[PDB]
Structures are given as structure tokens and as C-alpha cells.
Design a protein around this nucleic acid. Structure first.
Ligand code: K
Ligand code: K
Ligand code: K
Ligand code: K
Ligand code: K
Ligand code: K
Ligand code: K
Ligand code: K
Ligand code: K
Ligand code: K
Ligand code: K
Ligand code: K
Ligand code: MG
Ligand code: MG
Length: 1330
RNA sequence: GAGAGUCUCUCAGCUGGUACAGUUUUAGAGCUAGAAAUAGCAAGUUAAAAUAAGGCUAGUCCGUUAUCAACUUGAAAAAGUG
DNA sequence: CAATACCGTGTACCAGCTGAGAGACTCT
DNA sequence: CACGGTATTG
């Protein structure tokens, strides 16, 4: 028996079908195991496996790292307490015990309830003196008196526990950067460089203007207004803007050709500045560094809002300023509300449920919600002007612990810590001896290139130790091998050379690698002149001269430079034609020029004797990121360079790795020639062979040595699937598809199919907001100031396009109107009739698509000439990608050629994604295993890959319409159709095997691939007809009988029995919801620690059931404890699972059950299937809830009527009228549809209230247009859909979900265990238990 | 058809180092009039601790990804069964 | 046992490696 | 998000 398999691989479904030679789906009797009446069952060989989406590893990672975070912060606190141990025991022998048990209720505390001092008087006195921890911090920093050791510990521990970020390197002092003085020094430098045009900065209060709580451009405008005759876009204005963090363009200032866009926040700035300094000289360096100092001062003034000369604790002083202004403004507001609005005082200051001050301090209202609740109250009253100013400033009634404290560097807390230590070490010797230890506890963080400090039990760790002892912050450098660990951090992730699998790949910025790339590109260049008969290669001498003259003096080498600076200067050619390179050479010797600028010794770089050294240098600069370690490694070359050069080298860092090893490039040599690959690239006679030719040339030993260098352990199926590149969800689909195919082959008597057809489906507002913000601030536009928008709003396609286009038409140089977006047009850059791309990367917002030009191509040349500069501005602002820009500008490059259109249609039909090829390879290597007499693979099974458009057009052309919302059958159906089309297609044109089977003029191919599917049609327009029977031309075998086979497909799509199977899965992941709920009298609360009784301490609820368990046992009853037989579902929770599996009997007996029938324990994962009466089916949602378990097999006529009537997705107007006439002639179908649903709901769904409401809603809108009634009947199928119940809407009526909140009935129903395909079953009558 | 290097991007996956909030219990003596229910008023900004229960391998480590119908033999990994 | 309604930890930064989609140059 | 847990009302 011959058959083929159709597969439909999705992210939540794998559809499968089996077809015969006639495109029929077989049906078998399958054995049914179990204890029921039924010994066998009839099954069609079509169905679909359904599963929950596979999840990535990200969330797990973030939780794991948060875990390490909390562990290490606790360890810091433990280090500090161990330092304070003895002297604190001398002063108060229970302080740390009181701190530890602070969380406990006084009933469970072992010591006094007042943490700090242990008696109420002292505690109240403390809090009255220091209402916030910042008061105590400022006191301990500024005062000179001896202080209580407990208060010292509290300050230092608060600093260590919340120590602040590490985004700034080096040290930082409070008065290191004062805005006034740095602005004055910037004015000094500017007037030193520009004596003829000086600025009068007298009377300009730079402090308040730059350190104001305002946007960057607003403070810029403020300071520029204070300087008459100076504009914000002049030189000084741009310097201030760069200080304020904007993106100034110094081009117009210095009359530059290169766009000198400088933004200090960028990683490129260090280069972007130097590049600029290359054009205007080094006299301007002092200026551009004074501006950077000013920027640092402004950044600090953001955080420290107090004078740094009255205290050494500017941060704590600013927190105390927050507290004092909170107190004053709260007193004023209370008085104001007492006087003017005395009825609202209670709602404002007593009601936690409201977003007033009560909800702000005691409830759950945030600063933002509080400001929103209290702004109208302030505007409504009199005397609230300053309060409203502070509110719009986001500085009213501030707390100290807020969301925006993430700005605080750790250097600040460190300064305060160091100050306290210097104060109190005069009174405590142990603080003098352990000052640096405590400072280190604060400053030290495990380096990212070292990872978890494990000892052989972490699967994530790679760190290597210099000595075997406990790692502490004070011996890290001596116990951890920072060098070996930093090296392993990279060498455990970097590729080896595929040609030499034992050799490491070179750094991308290595000098040798760039030499290789340049020579490889340069070897295939060809040139022609007049007297020359034929185009020539460049000789070895010519290539060397072009490298020395051009590539070693210019960063980039254009074609024009090649023509004028070599062929004219050396060869005396006035005209020459070049091939093998266009506009400019892609390769270049960037590292050569970097090192030439740093060391300034060209003869050192050109000397081959230094090659090794240079490589090592670059290696280091690439392998490491810590400048101290780079310095340590380069120390062995300190004698070759000045100290200025060695510092400049330290700062020079590279990222990236190539794809070939040094041994391949310039190591292995050809036996006879004695030359390396690079030696051939430099000079290879008149052949000029490049890398591919070199390693593929049988006359050379490179190919032989590459063959010899190869090595093998083989992955398993699952391991091999896991190591593919792709979403983990699609990978889950791949593995399930393989398992389905294995079962299907086992079904067909271990006979392998003829062909297997596979189709794979295709593949955030915060990201959109970030893109638009960055693009507009880089563009310098004020559209956001004038049109504020939230991230959610950007989910509208037109508004997102409007903003990405700076509010302007993309085809016309004119502004657009937000309030008119509904009148505008979204147009595809390349037409969707060629490239089916609807992404933002191919779409464009324009006033009218007519203005694009002709609709049969790319935007016309006139539009390109008009809009090229605007498009390049959008490109540099990253508001359009380079791909979008190239497509937009293609008309100046000839536009769309006929070859491009042919390729686009081919892409529409021929699958080229790599993940699909990997699926095909897996199935192929699984099925075809034998080799013939020539030791070539015997391809018994042909694996065909199709794209969804083929079967989609098939459905839309032969009226095999699909409606996804009706049921899950469409997946299965898709599979079937694929298997059909696929097979038929390759039977009709066997030459297509090349492009459609795994394994090894433009108008003509356009026409061909556009008409490839016409052999199914009977008549074709653009109007010759076709036979009723389509056969293969050469073999004469029949492939499609247009009078019998369509009937076959219709009968297959009409079959009501389709094996839909929802994959039962144990639940995993978090134990429960994460919210810590307050204490409550409820056994649903779960203790967050072993002794934290939730009735006193609160805790969690809502745990996830890993899997239910059927228990047949006895439970005690009443006060007598009489044993009563029971049969029920106990939900084992994820957190209980290990304990329940280690010993199920003891777990159950501790849960209450006695005399447990151990062998009648049935493990029920989620989606376990139960059948009750009248074919009614339920799936296990949990231990106490059920999901719908039946599919509604709506007949095909109603499906197609719903598709056509609702205008689901056209064709000829005559065919459109015929479809409309069929819809209107079959209007009664509507009622019939309802009837079917009704008969289903009364039989399987059992939601009387919902069904009656839906029937009334349908009988209410019977005067609505047929299209809308059908569109809402589509909604109605949520009532019958398999799975969890959900709420839907019929027109404007809303039907809430009827839930199945009890699982008692399934305990007497028939449990059904299904194989992956649902063909094999085991049925268990549960009524026979108990 | 199957690929390779380079260039210009774009998306994705995987790992590590940190920070700020949030929440929970306790501590920040509420006062007065009332026997009480309650009413009037004062006050509020902070800290400690926990942040998957926990585990043994005891590390400044690990604990939410992937994988899983049923049945026999299996100790388990497996393999086999219509 | 009803319907029935409400609720669900979030944000930010820094460092790195890999594949792959798509346009272009050169090739097996 | 959905869809399972939870309390409320009855
Ligand atoms: K006690
Ligand atoms: K001015
Ligand atoms: K709050
Ligand atoms: K807080
Ligand atoms: K080029
Ligand atoms: K590096
Ligand atoms: K030196
Ligand atoms: K899972
Ligand atoms: K390539
Ligand atoms: K209290
Ligand atoms: K599992
Ligand atoms: K199953
Ligand atoms: Mg812990
Ligand atoms: Mg906190």
C-alpha cells in the first residue's frame, strides 16, 4: 500500500493527514485497550495535535539572577555584622538578634519588641531625633562626637544594603563638578579660542538654569535666551546642548563636510570626537572637554539638590530637603483644606481606598496616581500656586524611597560611608583597622566575566580558582584567577574554524584577518584600458602597491581613488574600467589605521617581525574588557612604546570574532608551492585564485588538509532540535512533528510513505516608544513636545508611521495632520503583488498613494529626487532602516527589473527559510538510510516543502474556504491539502524536484512561476482552456482528474470525525502567584517561611496544580472520626510535587486520607480527557475546574457560506456577483447554523443561561445586514470552541463565560488516554472504582 | 539546487554582573470626651527582615527553560505492545 | 452546588557570544 | 493576555 503524509507545523498545533494515490484519506479499525465495552474503534487518518506554546528561557534567567542578587546582598550584611560582632556584643549583646527577628509578632519574639535600643523611651527618642535614616546618615557624616555603635551600624548597613548603581567608572567627588564654575570655565575656553567673538556671561545664573528640573532643550533655550546675539544652534549653543545630553551637530559650526554628530551617552562618542578633532585640530580639544565636565556637573546636580559646602552628605541632605518640604507642604495643604473644603478632608487624609494622601502613604496609590488625584483639588482652591508648581515639577510631598533613586551612583553612598568611618574610627580601633574592608564590601561586585563563584555544582559557572578556599570580597584578586576566568568567559562561547575544527577563530579586528579580507576582495578585481585586448587581473606587485599607496593611507578606498591615485599616478592611464568592486571597497584595514594613530610608527606596523606582537595586542584588546587586565597583559610590551602610547592603547578596545583561524589564513602551506592562503591571495600568477578556489583546488594541498582536519559525539533527536536557531515554540512544534511522523509510520505497518509534504507557518509598544524617542531626539524635532503620545497608542499602524515620519508625507515634502490620519493612505514601497510584506519596514504613510507614481513598480524617480535627503535624515535617525531606504530609492538604480519580479514570485512559492530546511533534513535523514552501488543516498521518501500561499490560493480558488474560529479542524485540513497539492505538483512537473524536494529569460520564469498552479484549473484567463484530465507529459501517468478528485477533496474536508488531540502536559514554573497577600483567616494562604503562620504574617495563595491525582481511600468524618469511603481529585501543587512523588502514600496520609488504594492512583495532567453521556467530553483544567472537550463539526456548506457572507477575505466581478447571489439564495442557512450550534450546546456545552441569551440576541438583530450577522455568528463559536470557556460578544451583547467549577462528574465517567495522534486509545471506566 | 568569505543593516536566541521600586509583619508611646458603640482632633515621608517553600553537593552554589497518553519488563535509562 | 466579579510583581542599566533574513561584491 | 484561583452572595 502506497501513501503520503501531509504536515502543518505551527507554534500551537501540528496538523497531519495521510493520503493514498487517489488523494483519499484511509480509515482503519484501531484496537481500544481498557475496561469498557468498546474493543475497537473506526478512525480516519487525519487530525491535529494541539499544545501550549513553548516558552523561552528568559524569565527563568531573570528570576535566577534576582535570586543570586538577594543572596549576595544578604551576604554583604552578614560580612558587616561579622565585622561588628565583638564590640557590639560589648555594647548590646542582643542588637543583631532583635534585628533578625524584627519581622516576628511580639508573641513569637524572643527579645524586646523595640529593635534599636530595646526600650520604648530610647526608641521614641531616636525616631524623634532622626525621623528618617538620612537624618542619622547626615549626622554621622557631619558630627565629630562619639556615637552609639548601633547607630553607626545602622547607617553603614543601610548604605551597603542599598548601595546604588555601577554605571560610572572611576572616582567621584561631591564638589568635583560645580555647574557655575564649569560653565564659567567653558566660557573661559570659548573666549580663549574665539577672541574676536566673545560672550558676555555676567549676570547669567548658570546654576539655577542648568540644574533646573526641566527638559534638556528647555534649559538650553533658557540659557541661550540669557545670551543676546547667540543662538541655540551656534557653537556655544551646541556645546551647551552637548553638555545637556542632546545630540548636537557641530558640522555647521566648523564648516565640516563630515556630519559631526556628538552625543556623550553613545559608545561611539570617544571616536566621533577624535574624528571631529582630526578635521578642526587639537586646539578645540580643551573646549570639548570643558563641556564634558559641565555635563558631569549637571548630571550630579540632578541628584544632589543641596549646596555641597555646608555638608559632606549632599545626598542625605537632599533627602532631608525632601522630608522638610513634604512636612511644610503637608501642613499648608491640611490648613488649606480645613479652611476652604472641609468636607473633603476625611476622603483626602483618612481614606486608604481613595488616591489621596491616605492612599498615598498607607494604601496602594503611587506618586503619579496621587498627583493625578490631587491636581484638580489644588487648582480648585486658592493659595496652591507653589504647590501646583512643585506638582508639575514632580517634587511635591516626595518620599525618600522612590522609583527614581536608580540614578544614584554607588560613589555617593561610598563617600558618605567613608566620611562616617573617618569620623568614628577616632573612637573605635576596629573601625580604623576595618575601614578598607567595609569600603570594599560596599564597592566590590563579582565581575560579569567571572560569573557564579561555584565549586563544581553550577551548570552555569566557568570561574577558575588560583587556590581552594572561600572567596571573600577582600581576597577575590588572590583566590579567583581573573585572567583564566575572563578568558573562559569568551572561549566557551566562540566558534572554532569549521575548516580546522581544533583552531580558534581570529579576532575580527586582527591585522592578519583584515589583510586577508582586503587581499581576497582585491584579487578578483579586473581592469581594462584602450590598448588591452582583454580585461586583466592585478599582479602581485600591483596589489602590493595598491595596498601600500591606498589601503595604508585611507580608511576607505573608493573606485575613484583606485582610478586616479593608482592607475593615473603609476600606470599613466587617463581612462580605465574596473570590475569586481563598485563605488568603494568593502574590505579595509581599519585596525591598521587605529594602531597607526595610536603608536605613530608606520615602519613598526609594516615590519613583519612585529606581526606576532601586533596580533597578540589585538587579541588582548578583543578578549578582555577590563582596562586593568588589558594593561596587565600589554605590560610585556611596555618597552616598545612610550607611556602616552601605552595609555592610548589601553583605552583602545575591539569586539567581535571572525570566521577563520590564523592557521588557515597564514599557517598551513601547500606542499609543492610552500605558500599559505594569504601568500596566494597576495600573488597567484595570472590565475588570481581566491579563498574558495584555493580550498577547492585539487592541484593544491589545502583541500586535502581541510578534509584531514575534520573530526566527528552525535546529538540525540531532542538535543539536535534544541541546538537549532529559532523560537523555542517552533522547536517544540518540530519535535512533535517528528514524533507524529514516527507514529504514523508505525500505523501503516512500518511501511514508509512515498512523499512527506511539510508547510511551516510564518513568524513591544515600549520598543516602539524607545525607537520614536531616540529618532526624534537624534533628529532634533519638536513633534513630541507638540503631540504627546503613550506607548499603547503606537499600536495603531498609521500613528506609528506618522511619528516615524516626523509627521510628514513620505512621498511629498509637506506636513501631515494627526486629526486627519483616517483620510491618509498606507502604501507598500514595493507592491504587495510582488512582495507580500506588511511590516513597517515596507509600509509608508502618505497623503495619497497616487503620489507614489505608477502602482506597477517602486516609487518613481521624481519622488526619489524630491525625498532622498529627507529619507537619509530618517535613516540616520534610525526612523527607517537601510532596507526600507534602499527599497524607497531603487528607482534611481533602475527600479524593479523583470528578474526581480520573477524572483519575488518564486519567493512567494518556494520556501527558503533555514528552519524549514532543517526540519526537512531531519525527516529525510530519518526516512532515507540506505546507499546504492555508488554509495549515494537512496531517496525512497521525498520530503517536499511548500509555503502557505499555495494551499491558501488553492482554497480561495476552488472554494475550500476556511474559518479558523469554527473549530480546530482547519489545521488538519491544511495538512491534507498540502499533501494533495505537493504530490500532485511534483507529479505534474518532476523537474521542480530541485526546488521542492530536499536533497542534491526573466519573463519566461515570471510567466512560468505565476502560472505553475494553472493545471488544476479548467479554464484560465490571461483565455485558453485545459483538459479535464491532467497527466504527466513524459510518463503519461495521470495526476489530476478534474471531475473526480475535487469530489474526493470535498468528501475529505466534509468528514466530521477528525482526531484533534490536546497534548496533556504537567504544569511547571512558579509555585503560585507572586503577590504577598496580607494576613487573613483562610486556609488558602501559604507560608512564605516555615514558621511564618499566614494567619499572623500573610503569604501567598493561588498555587498552580502540577497534576491532579485520583484518590480512592477513606477519610475520617465528624467528631467520631468514622472512616468513610471517598473517590475524589486531589490537585498536587508544583511545590508539593517532589514530596508527593518521593512517597505518595505518606503524602496522602498526611493530607488526611487513610487506606489508600495505591494501585488505583491515576496521575491526571492538565487537559486529561473524560467522556460522559451523549459523547459529551471534558478536559481537566485543574483539580477543581473543567474545560470544554468536544469539537463542533459544522458541515462544509455552512462553513463556506459563513466565509463568503462575512467577506472573510476577491476575483472577477461576475464571480463576485455569483458568490453574492449564492449567499442571498442560501439565507436560511443562517437559522440552520444557529440550530446546529443550539443542538450542540444543549448536548455538550450545557450553559442554559448563555444559550438563551445568545438565542435572544440572534432573534434581536435579524434585521441587520447579512454580512454583519455572519461576522457575529463567527463570534458565537466561542461558546462551542474546545478549551477553556471565554467571554464573547454578539453585536453589542456580551456573553460572559460559563465555567465548569466542579470536577465531581469525571470521577464516574470514562477517562481516555490518547497516543500523540489520537488513533490509539485506552479507555478506563472510572465508575468501576470505589 | 547546496553552500563560503566580505560589507551594510535588521531580528532573534543563550549566558553573566548589578540597581531601583513594590509587597508583606514588626518598630516608629496617638490624644481627648465618653462605661461602651463612637465623635472631635493630632499624625503620616523612615527602618529591620523576607522575596519562590527550600535542597545538599554546604558553593558568596542550586531551586520557574526544554522533555512527559496508557500498558508490560525494567531498579532507572530504556526497549517493546495494537 | 450557582452566577458573579475581581485579580494576577514591575522597572532600569551594563558586558558578551551565536544564528539568520535581506540587499550587495566575489566565488565553490 | 487568558484562564485558573479566590471570595462574595445566595
Ligand atoms: K516576647
Ligand atoms: K539670544
Ligand atoms: K501607596
Ligand atoms: K518604601
Ligand atoms: K561596494
Ligand atoms: K573587548
Ligand atoms: K617605554
Ligand atoms: K513545562
Ligand atoms: K552569505
Ligand atoms: K506602629
Ligand atoms: K515533566
Ligand atoms: K497524549
Ligand atoms: Mg533565600
Ligand atoms: Mg523596600
Amino acid at each position: 500500500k502506497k501513501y503520503s503524509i501531509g504536515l502543518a507545523i505551527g507554534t500551537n498545533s501540528v496538523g497531519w493527514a495521510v493520503i493514498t494515490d487517489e488523494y483519499k484519506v484511509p480509515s482503519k479499525k484501531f484496537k481500544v485497550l481498557g475496561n469498557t465495552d468498546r474493543h475497537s474503534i473506526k478512525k480516519n487518518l487525519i487530525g491535529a495535535l494541539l499544545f501550549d506554546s513553548g516558552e523561552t528561557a528568559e524569565a527563568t534567567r531573570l528570576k535566577r539572577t534576582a535570586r543570586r542578587r538577594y543572596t549576595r546582598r544578604k551576604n554583604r550584611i552578614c560580612y558587616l555584622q561579622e565585622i561588628f560582632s565583638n564590640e557590639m556584643a560589648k555594647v548590646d549583646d542582643s542588637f543583631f538578634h532583635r534585628l533578625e527577628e524584627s519581622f516576628l509578632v511580639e508573641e513569637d519574639k524572643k527579645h524586646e519588641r523595640h529593635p534599636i535600643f530595646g526600650n520604648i523611651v530610647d526608641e521614641v527618642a531616636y525616631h524623634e531625633k532622626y525621623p528618617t535614616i538620612y537624618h542619622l546618615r547626615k549626622k554621622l557624616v557631619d558630627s565629630t562626637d562619639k556615637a552609639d555603635l548601633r547607630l553607626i551600624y545602622l547607617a553603614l548597613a543601610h548604605m551597603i544594603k542599598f548601595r546604588g548603581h555601577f554605571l560610572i567608572e572611576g572616582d567621584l567627588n561631591p564638589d568635583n563638578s560645580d555647574v557655575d564654575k564649569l560653565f564659567i570655565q567653558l566660557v573661559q575656553t570659548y573666549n580663549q579660542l574665539f577672541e574676536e567673538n566673545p560672550i558676555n556671561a555676567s549676570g547669567v545664573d548658570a546654576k539655577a538654569i542648568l540644574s533646573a528640573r526641566l527638559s534638556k532643550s528647555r534649559r538650553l533655550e533658557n540659557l541661550i535666551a540669557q545670551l543676546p546675539g547667540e543662538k541655540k544652534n551656534g557653537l556655544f549653543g551646541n556645546l551647551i546642548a552637548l553638555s545637556l545630553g542632546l545630540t548636537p551637530n557641530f558640522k555647521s559650526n566648523f564648516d565640516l563636510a563630515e556630519d559631526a554628530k556628538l552625543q556623550l551617552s553613545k559608545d561611539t562618542y570617544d571616536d566621533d570626537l577624535d574624528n571631529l578633532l582630526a578635521q578642526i585640530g587639537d586646539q578645540y580639544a580643551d573646549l570639548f572637554l570643558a563641556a564634558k565636565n559641565l555635563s558631569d556637573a549637571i548630571l550630579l546636580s540632578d541628584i544632589l539638590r543641596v549646596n555641597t559646602e555646608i555638608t559632606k552628605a549632599p545626598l542625605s541632605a537632599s533627602m532631608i530637603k525632601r522630608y522638610d518640604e513634604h512636612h511644610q507642604d503637608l501642613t499648608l495643604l491640611k490648613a488649606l483644606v480645613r479652611q476652604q473644603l472641609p468636607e473633603k478632608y476625611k476622603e483626602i487624609f483618612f481614606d486608604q481606598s481613595k488616591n489621596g494622601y491616605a492612599g498615598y502613604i498607607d494604601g496602594g496609590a503611587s506618586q503619579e496616581e496621587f498627583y493625578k488625584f490631587i491636581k484638580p483639588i489644588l487648582e480648585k482652591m486658592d493659595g496652591t500656586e507653589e504647590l501646583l508648581v512643585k506638582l508639575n515639577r514632580e517634587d511635591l510631598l516626595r518620599k525618600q524611597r522612590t522609583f527614581d533613586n536608580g540614578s544614584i551612583p554607588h560613589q555617593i553612598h561610598l563617600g558618605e560611608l567613608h566620611a562616617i568611618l573617618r569620623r568614628q574610627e577616632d573612637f573605635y580601633p576596629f573601625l580604623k583597622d576595618n575601614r578598607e574592608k567595609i569600603e570594599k564590601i560596599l564597592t566590590f561586585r563579582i565581575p560579569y566575566y567571572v560569573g557564579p563563584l561555584a565549586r563544581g555544582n553550577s551548570r552555569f559557572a566557568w570561574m577558575t580558582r588560583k587556590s581552594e578556599e572561600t572567596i571573600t570580597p577582600w581576597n577575590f584578586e588572590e583566590v579567583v584567577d581573573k585572567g583564566a576566568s575572563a578568558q573562559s568567559f569568551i572561549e566557551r562561547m566562540t566558534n572554532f574554524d569549521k575548516n580546522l575544527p581544533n583552531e580558534k577563530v581570529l579576532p575580527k579586528h586582527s591585522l592578519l584577518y583584515e589583510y586577508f579580507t582586503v587581499y581576497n576582495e582585491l584579487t578578483k578585481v579586473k581592469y581594462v584600458t584602450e590598448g588591452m585586448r582583454k580585461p586583466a587581473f592585478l599582479s602581485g606587485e600591483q596589489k602590493k602597491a595598491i595596498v601600500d599607496l591606498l589601503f595604508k593611507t585611507n580608511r576607505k578606498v573608493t573606485v575613484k581613488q583606485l582610478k586616479e591615485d593608482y592607475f593615473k599616478k603609476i600606470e599613466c592611464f587617463d581612462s580605465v574600467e574596473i570590475s569586481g568592486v563598485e563605488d568603494r571597497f568593502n574590505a579595509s584595514l581599519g585596525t591598521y589605521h587605529d594602531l597607526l594613530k595610536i603608536i605613530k610608527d608606520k615602519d613598526f606596523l609594516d615590519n613583519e617581525e612585529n606581526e606576532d606582537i601586533l596580533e597578540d595586542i589585538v587579541l588582548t584588546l578583543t578578549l578582555f574588557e577590563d582596562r586593568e587586565m588589558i594593561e596587565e597583559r600589554l605590560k610585556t610590551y611596555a618597552h616598545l612604546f612610550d607611556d602616552k602610547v601605552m595609555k592610548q592603547l589601553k583605552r583602545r578596545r575591539y569586539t567581535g570574532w571572525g570566521r577563520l583561524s590564523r592557521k588557515l589564513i597564514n599557517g598551513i602551506r601547500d606542499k609543492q608551492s610552500g605558500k599559505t592562503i594569504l601568500d596566494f591571495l597576495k600573488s597567484d600568477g595570472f590565475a588570481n585564485r581566491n579563498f574558495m578556489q584555493l580550498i577547492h583546488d585539487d592541484s593544491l594541498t589545502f583541500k586535502e588538509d581541510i578534509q584531514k582536519a575534520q573530526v566527528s559525539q552525535g546529538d540525540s533527536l531532542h538535543e539536535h532540535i534544541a541546538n537549532l536557531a529559532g523560537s523555542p515554540a517552533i522547536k517544540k512544534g518540530i519535535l512533535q512533528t517528528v514524533k507524529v511522523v514516527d507514529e504514523l509510520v508505525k500505523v501503516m505497518g512500518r511501511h514508509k510513505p512515498e512523499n512527506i509534504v511539510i508547510e511551516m507557518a510564518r513568524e513591544n509598544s515600549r520598543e516602539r516608544m524607545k525607537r520614536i524617542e531616540e529618532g526624534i531626539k537624534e533628529l532634533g524635532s519638536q513633534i513630541l513636545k507638540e503631540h504627546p503620545v503613550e506607548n499603547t497608542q503606537l499600536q495603531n499602524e498609521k500613528l506609528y508611521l506618522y511619528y516615524l515620519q516626523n509627521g510628514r508625507d513620505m512621498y511629498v515634502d509637506q506636513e501631515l495632520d494627526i486629526n486627519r490620519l483616517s483620510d491618509y493612505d498606507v502604501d507598500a514601497i514595493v507592491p504587495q503583488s510582488f512582495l507580500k510584506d506588511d511590516s513597517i519596514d515596507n509600509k509608508v504613510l502618505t497623503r495619497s498613494d497616487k503620489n507614489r507614481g505608477k502602482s506597477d513598480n517602486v516609487p518613481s524617480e521624481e519622488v526619489v529626487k524630491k525625498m532622498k535627503n529627507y529619507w537619509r535624515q530618517l535613516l540616520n535617525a534610525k526612523l527607517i532602516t537601510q532596507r526600507k531606504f534602499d527599497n524607497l530609492t531603487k528607482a534611481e538604480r533602475g527600479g524593479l527589473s523583470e528578474l526581480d519580479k520573477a524572483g519575488f514570485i518564486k519567493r512567494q512559492l518556494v520556501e527558503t527559510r533555514q528552519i524549514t530546511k532543517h526540519v526537512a533534513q531531519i525527516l529525510d535523514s530519518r526516512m532515507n538510510t540506505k546507499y546504492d552501488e555508488n554509495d549515494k543516498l537512496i531517496r525512497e521518501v521525498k520530503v517536499i516543502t511548500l509555503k502557505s500561499k499555495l494551499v491558501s490560493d488553492f482554497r480561495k480558488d476552488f472554494q475550500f474556504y476556511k474559518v479558523r474560529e469554527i473549530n480546530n479542524y482547519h489545521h488538519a485540513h491544511d495538512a491534507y491539502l498540502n499533501a494533495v497539492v505537493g504530490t500532485a505538483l511534483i507529479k505534474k512537473y518532476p523537474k521542480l524536484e530541485s526546488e521542492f524536494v530536499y536533497g542534491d529569460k526573466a519573463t519566461a520564469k515570471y510567466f512560468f512561476y505565476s502560472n505553475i498552479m494553472n493545471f488544476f484549473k479548467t479554464e484560465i484567463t490571461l483565455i485558453r482552456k485545459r483538459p479535464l484530465i491532467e497527466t504527466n507529459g513524459e510518463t503519461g501517468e495521470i495526476v489530476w482528474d478534474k471531475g473526480r478528485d475535487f469530489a474526493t477533496v470535498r468528501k475529505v474536508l466534509s468528514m466530521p470525525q477528525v482526531n484533534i488531540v490536546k497534548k496533556t502536559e504537567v504544569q511547571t514554573g512558579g509555585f503560585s502567584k507572586e503577590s504577598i497577600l496580607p494576613k487573613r483567616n483562610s486556609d488558602k494562604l501559604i507560608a512564605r517561611k516555615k514558621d511564618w503562620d499566614p494567619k499572623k504574617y500573610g503569604g501567598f495563595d493561588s498555587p498552580t496544580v502540577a497534576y491532579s491525582v485520583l484518590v480512592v481511600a477513606k477519610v475520617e468524618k465528624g467528631k467520631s472520626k468514622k472512616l468513610k469511603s471517598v473517590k475524589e481529585l486531589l490537585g498536587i501543587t508544583i511545590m508539593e510535587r517532589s514530596s508527593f512523588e518521593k512517597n505518595p502514600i505518606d503524602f496522602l496520609e498526611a493530607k488526611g486520607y487513610k487506606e489508600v488504594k495505591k494501585d488505583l492512583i491515576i496521575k491526571l495532567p492538565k487537559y486529561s480527557l473524560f467522556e460522559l453521556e451523549n459523547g459529551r467530553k471534558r478536559m481537566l483544567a485543574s483539580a477543581g475546574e473543567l474545560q470544554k472537550g468536544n469539537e463542533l463539526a459544522l458541515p462544509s456548506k455552512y462553513v463556506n457560506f459563513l466565509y463568503l457572507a462575512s467577506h472573510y477575505e476577491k476575483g472577477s466581478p461576475e464571480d463576485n456577483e455569483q458568490k453574492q447571489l449564492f449567499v442571498e439564495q442560501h439565507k436560511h442557512y443562517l437559522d440552520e447554523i444557529i440550530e446546529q450550534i443550539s443542538e450542540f450546546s444543549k448536548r455538550v456545552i450545557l450553559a442554559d443561561a448563555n444559550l438563551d441569551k445568545v438565542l435572544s440576541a440572534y432573534n434581536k438583530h435579524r434585521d441587520k445586514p447579512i454580512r454583519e450577522q455572519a461576522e457575529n455568528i463567527i463570534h458565537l463559536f466561542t461558546l462551542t470552541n474546545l478549551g477553556a470557556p471565554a467571554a464573547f460578544k454578539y453585536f453589542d451583547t456580551t456573553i460572559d463565560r460559563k465555567r465548569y467549577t466542579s470536577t465531581k462528574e469525571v470521577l464516574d465517567a470514562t477517562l481516555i488516554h490518547q497516543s500523540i495522534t489520537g488513533l490509539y486509545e485506552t479507555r478506563i471506566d472510572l465508575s468501576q472504582l470505589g
